[PDB]
């Protein structure tokens, strides 16, 4: 987004 | 929440 | 913030 | 691995 | 450890 | 490094 938005699903994904 | 939320409690705790 | 807010731009910066 | 390992692939991928 | 070592267990813990 | 290495000292710094 830069901002890092973190999700977990297990892999962690940080999207910009 | 899964959206991962980070807290600096020191140890870092990532909460869902 | 203590909630952590992550930024990237390189290197990542987590600001409380 | 769980030990969390971070990769900057951009998106950040935390792998176990 | 400073170095942040990340573990997952689900909560993520980053220990110094 | 791209593997990410996190440091804290405040704010967190992730170095590739």
HSE-CB of E2 using CA atoms within 13 angstroms: 12
Contact assessment for residue A4 and residue A16, using Cβ atoms and an 8 Å cutoff = yes
Q: CA D14, CA F2: separation in Å to the nearest integer?
A: 12
F6/C contact by beta carbon, under 8 A: yes
B13/C contact by beta carbon, under 8 A: no
Strand pairing report for D3-8 and D12-15: antiparallel
Which residue in this structure is represented by tokens 């910066």? Answer: C13
**CA dist., res. E7 & res. C16, Å (int):** 20
The answer to whether C12 contacts A4, with C-beta atoms less than 8 Å apart, is yes
CA of residue D15 relative to chain centroid, distance: 4
Count interface pairs B-E at CB distance under 8 A: 25
Closest by CA position to C11, among listed D12, A6, F13: F13
Resolution of this deposited model, Å: 2.6
CA A10/CA C13 separation, integer angstroms? 24
Contacts of C1 in chain F (CB under 8 A): none
With tokens 């267990």, the residue in question is E9
In whole angstroms, what is the distance from residue E13 CA to residue F2 CA?
22
């Amino acid at each position: 987004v830069a901002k890092l938005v973190f999700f977990a699903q297990a892999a962690i994904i940080g999207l910009m």
